[PDB]
Design a protein around this nucleic acid. Structure first.
Ligand SMILES: OC[C@H]1O[C@@H](n2cnc3c(NCc4ccccc4)ncnc32)[C@H](O)[C@@H]1O
Ligand SMILES: [K+]
Ligand SMILES: [K+]
Length: 542
DNA sequence: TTCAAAAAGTCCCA
DNA sequence: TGGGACTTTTTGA
């Protein structure tokens, strides 16, 4: 496949947003383009809107211009000759769209091509549509070479194709033109989006951002969506209207139009000064802005200053190396090769569940002839798969070695761990030398900062409600009740030390002591957490 | 030599 | 089919 249907409410909102206040009398030849038209979800609606626009002013146009040209009977043809433009890579979609535009009642400006390679011969008044989203794993590598060569200002490292579509749209937009598109929301906060953000802020005035957060706009699609509207007008003041959803549980058809949704109690509205955006786009209301600025100002250190961070093991084929601790095959493996192994769901606040899995740290198997039983009966079962790994085909790793085995000495110590995707802050102290995959991240404290910061104090403040809200201010929202907890944002969290250090650390130690008992009652832990939150709010003056 | 980012997620049930 | 639990390894740098 490859063609995705956009909900009609979204299409109507986008077309109306671009064409609401067009002066058809002053310009009866607007050029309106969709470079991912597909079957023409947007373009057919553009035809309807334009037909009403032209018919409403047919006699005014007849008087101001050639009176024989401007007839209702001539509207259709005119629309299809000078106004509607579409491009797509699929021949069948273009043929279907051409048939529909013909049946609305002549040369139709429909192109079957790759929009990122087409030499565009003129700019456009209005651009709308839904571009393709393809990530770094699902993109062919020759095409990635092309993108890296030609779209270097926005496409780099782990970036996405729709970054290039943003750049192309911006480049072929007329002065005073208006663009409105629906894309994934991740570029707003992702590390890969940085350059793209810089390209937008520097080249268009951003009118409006609609952030649906984790709501499901596309049925049976695992993606989170936003709508962006921007222009190239001579702007005096550059202020952005931000509509952020307040309940991800909504159904999009709650009203006849998206405008009713935006103005209702289901959304929140606020304004952001485009001139005040840094390389990061902190899009929050004034209360959250004050909260964030207080926290940033009062804190002297960051986690990056005082800690060393790392990503977990990447075996390359988990079924070959990970076994249940009760699996009989572990009798074939010397215990010097076995490590405790945990998943992201084993990380609670302040402590980790006990391990249920073992990792065969196969890097320390010297010769294949020694311990050949392990290679024959456990790892070799997936040998074919293991040989398709990149470092095996290139020869850097033997077929039975872990793909990215990291350094054991970093794991086999006291450290703090957190899951890579979570609904809330879950920072735990690891006491058991646990190993994990890339779905859990770790850090430990630098030696020179041990006397300023203990592990108990850090898990105490990082697990608080204050720091939950503070981290989620700028965190990358992925899907319903899921944020990314990656070092590129976690290590930028700022921390403090003051008169309340000792009581916070003591409360943290009490919480840890309760959580490790045979008969845990979480209630006193909740009360202690409330008291610690009061201490933190006192320290930060919020 | 070897790090860390990346949801048109994935999979399964009522 | 829609909603909830949970999260691998490929890949550029
Ligand atoms: O998904 C939304 C619609 O977008 C279309 N579309 C996807 N990639 C496109 C492209 N260049 C990118 C490209 C990437 C790899 C190979 C060729 C082209 N140029 C034009 N249209 C493209 C799909 O057919 C859908 O109808
Ligand atoms: K006339
Ligand atoms: K979603």
């Amino acid at each position: 496949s490859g063609i995705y249907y956009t909900p009609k409410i979204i299409v109507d909102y986008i077309v109306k947003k671009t064409l609401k206040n067009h002066d058809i009398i002053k310009n009866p030849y607007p050029r309106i383009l969709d470079i991912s038209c597909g079957c023409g979800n947007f373009l057919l609606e553009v035809y309807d809107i334009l037909y009403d626009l032209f018919e409403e002013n047919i006699y005014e146009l007849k008087k101001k211009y050639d009176e024989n040209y401007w007839t209702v009977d001539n509207i259709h043809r005119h629309i299809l000759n000078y106004c509607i433009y579409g491009a797509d890579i699929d021949e069948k979609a273009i043929s279907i769209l051409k048939d529909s535009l013909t049946n609305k009642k002549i040369k139709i400006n429909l192109f079957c091509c790759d929009s990122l390679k087409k030499k565009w011969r003129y700019k456009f008044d209005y651009i709308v549509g839904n571009p393709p989203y393809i990530g770094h794993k699902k993109l062919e590598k020759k095409y990635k070479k092309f993108l890296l060569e030609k779209y270097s200002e926005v496409y780099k490292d782990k970036a996405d194709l729709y970054f290039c579509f943003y750049k192309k749209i911006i480049d072929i937009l007329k002065q005073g033109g208006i663009g409105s598109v629906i894309t994934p929301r991740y570029f707003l906060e992702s590390l890969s989006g940085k350059d793209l953000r810089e390209y937008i802020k520097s080249n268009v005035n951003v009118q409006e951002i609609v952030d649906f957060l984790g709501a499901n706009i596309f049925k049976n699609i695992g993606v989170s969506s936003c709508i962006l509207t921007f222009d190239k007008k001579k702007t005096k003041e550059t202020y952005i209207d931000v509509f952020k959803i307040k309940n991800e549980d909504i159904c999009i058809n709650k009203f006849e139009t998206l405008e009713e949704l935006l103005k209702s109690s289901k959304f929140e509205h606020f304004n952001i000064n485009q001139r005040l955006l840094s390389d990061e786009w902190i899009l929050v209301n004034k209360d959250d802005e004050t909260f964030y600025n207080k926290i940033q100002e009062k804190c002297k250190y960051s986690l990056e200053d005082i800690a060393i961070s790392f990503q977990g093991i990447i075996t390359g084929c988990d079924k070959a190396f990970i076994l249940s601790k009760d699996d009989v095959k572990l009798n074939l493996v010397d215990d010097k090769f076995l490590k405790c192994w945990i998943k992201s769901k084993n990380i609670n606040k302040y402590i980790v569940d006990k391990s249920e899995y073992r990792l065969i740290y196969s890097n320390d198997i010297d010769n294949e002839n020694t311990n050949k039983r392990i290679l024959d009966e456990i790892i070799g079962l997936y040998k074919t798969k293991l040989e398709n790994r990149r470092e095996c085909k290139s020869g850097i790793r033997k077929w039975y070695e872990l793909q990215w085995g990291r350094e054991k000495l970093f794991f086999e110590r006291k450290k703090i761990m957190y899951p890579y995707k979570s609904n809330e802050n879950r920072f735990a102290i690891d006491y058991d030398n646990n190993f994990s995959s890339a779905d859990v991240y770790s850090f430990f404290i630098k030696e020179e900062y041990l006397d300023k910061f203990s592990y108990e104090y850090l898990v105490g403040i990082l697990n608080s409600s204050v720091y939950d809200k503070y981290f989620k201010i700028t965190a990358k929202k992925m899907s319903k009740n899921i944020y990314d907890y990656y070092p590129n944002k976690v290590m930028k969290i700022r921390i403090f030390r003051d008169n309340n250090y000792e009581e916070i650390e003591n409360l943290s130690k009490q919480i840890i002591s309760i959580l490790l008992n045979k008969s845990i009652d979480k209630g006193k832990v909740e009360k202690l957490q409330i008291k610690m939150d009061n201490l933190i709010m006192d320290s930060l003056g919020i």
